[PDB]
UniProtKB/Swiss-Prot annotation:
It is found in: Nucleus. Expressed at varying levels in several tissues, whereas a smaller transcript was expressed specifically in testis. Residues 9-113 form the Bromo domain. Belongs to the WAL family. Regulatory subunit of the ATP-dependent BRF-1 and BRF-5 ISWI chromatin remodeling complexes, which form ordered nucleosome arrays on chromatin and facilitate access to DNA during DNA-templated processes such as DNA replication, transcription, and repair. Both complexes regulate the spacing of nucleosomes along the chromatin and have the ability to slide mononucleosomes to the center of a DNA template. The BRF-1 ISWI chromatin remodeling complex has a lower ATP hydrolysis rate than the BRF-5 ISWI chromatin remodeling complex. Component of the BRF-1 ISWI chromatin remodeling complex, at least composed of SMARCA1 and BAZ2B, which regulates the spacing of histone octamers on the DNA template to facilitate access to DNA. Within the BRF-1 ISWI chromatin remodeling complex interacts with SMARCA1; the interaction is direct. Component of the BRF-5 ISWI chromatin remodeling complex, at least composed of SMARCA5/SNF2H and BAZ2B, which regulates the spacing of histone octamers on the DNA template to facilitate access to DNA. This is Bromodomain adjacent to zinc finger domain protein 2B.
């Protein structure tokens, strides 16, 4: 509350460490469904169904331009990528399986880096 604060967690490396996590996600072999925005002209249903499209390139541009106020807003956009994928793709498809794998990969990195 006013003039009463928990001790200051060091957040000065968060930007660098999110960039590293994101590099590791970008270079994973199963990243290919996620690298670029889904082409809303060419994928029927995507525009109407997925209210907030997100992809790694968009996260990378937001990160690089100071559009994440903190590491939680960054994790929200990464998870959005996987939540979108599960919304649109059957579990038993290559893209569906890609999405589960990447989410697992991300969550381990996240826990090991920050928790």
């Amino acid at each position: 509350s006013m003039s009463v604060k928990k001790p200051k967690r060091d957040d000065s490396k968060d930007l660098a460490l999110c960039s590293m996590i994101l590099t590791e996600m970008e270079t994973h072999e199963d990243a290919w469904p996620f690298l670029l925005p889904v082409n809303l002209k060419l994928v029927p249903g995507y525009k109407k169904v997925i209210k907030k499209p997100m992809d790694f390139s968009t996260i990378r541009e937001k990160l690089s331009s100071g559009q994440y106020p903190n590491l939680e807003t960054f994790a929200l956009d990464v998870r959005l990528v996987f939540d979108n994928c599960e919304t649109f793709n059957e579990d038993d498809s290559d893209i569906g399986r890609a999405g589960h794998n990447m989410r697992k990969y991300f969550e381990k990195k996240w826990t090991d880096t920050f928790k």
